[PDB]
């Protein structure tokens, strides 16, 4: 699956929280294993 499938529900949550950059969102989700909480931490830190 492409990440847009794979991470559909977590991309929505991230976008709903003001995180719109797709590449950054996907990168953060891959490092977190698909965890939104972890992705959010990455997106806020650095």
Swiss-Prot record:
Domain UBA: 2-46
Subcellular location as annotated: Nucleus
Additional note from the record: Present with 3930 molecules/cell in log phase SD medium.
Gene: DSK2
Function (record text): Involved, with RAD23 in spindle pole body duplication. Involved in the ubiquitin-proteasome proteolytic pathway.
Portion of the parent chain present: 326 to 371 of 373
Name of this protein: Ubiquitin domain-containing protein DSK2
């Amino acid at each position: 699956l492409d990440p847009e499938e794979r991470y559909e529900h977590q991309l929505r949550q991230l976008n709903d929280m003001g995180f719109f950059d797709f590449d950054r969102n996907v990168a953060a989700l891959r490092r977190s294993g698909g965890s939104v909480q972890g992705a959010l931490d990455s997106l806020l830190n650095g």
